[PDB]
Design a protein around this ligand. Structure first.
Ligand SMILES: Cc1cc2nc3c(=O)[nH]c(=O)nc-3n(C[C@H](O)[C@H](O)[C@H](O)COP(=O)(O)O)c2cc1C
Ligand SMILES: [Cl-]
Length: 131
């Protein structure tokens, strides 16, 4: 459950932008989305639950950034990327995206956490250069 994790409760209380996915459901869809995520992206909660978060990507999103995310998920490593994302209205923003495994007491991945932060184009260019 989403509220099993004190990090999730903290981010909820702090009114941050995040989602929780469930990799045991086909296509690793979102099972919880914060209000901040909804406001950032322009989607209603009923439009995001049950969907993989790739709906935020579009033609100007760098496929190499998406590949870094993919590899983090396949290798079990926490990961930070900066990539271009799209709101429901088609407007774009740079997203500094953090994805981490949420584990049980035996080490199994039960859920993934993704935390989104809108950053400026200038911040994004500097981040990508430094990577
Ligand atoms: C918890 C979580 C949150 C994610 N949040 C975003 C996001 O904010 N923006 C984005 O472009 N991709 C995000 N993704 C990445 C996509 O959901 C997806 O993992 C990536 O596009 C590769 O999927 P594929 O291997 O099916 O191509 C997130 C993934 C997870 C697991
Ligand atoms: Cl995925």
């Amino acid at each position: 459950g989403a509220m099993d994790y004190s990090l999730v409760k903290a981010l909820q209380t702090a009114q941050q932008n995040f989602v929780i996915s469930d990799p045991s459901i086909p296509d690793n869809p979102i099972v919880y989305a914060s209000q901040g995520f909804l406001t950032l992206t322009g989607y209603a909660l009923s439009e995001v639950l049950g969907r993989n978060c790739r709906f935020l990507q579009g033609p100007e999103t760098d496929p190499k950034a998406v590949e870094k995310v993919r590899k983090g998920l396949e290798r079990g490593e926490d990961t930070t990327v900066v990539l271009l994302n799209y709101r429901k209205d088609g407007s774009t923003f740079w997203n500094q995206l953090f994805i981490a495994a949420l584990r049980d007491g035996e080490g199994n991945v039960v859920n993934y956490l993704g935390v989104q932060c809108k950053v400026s184009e200038d911040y994004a260019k500097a981040f990508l250069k430094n990577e």
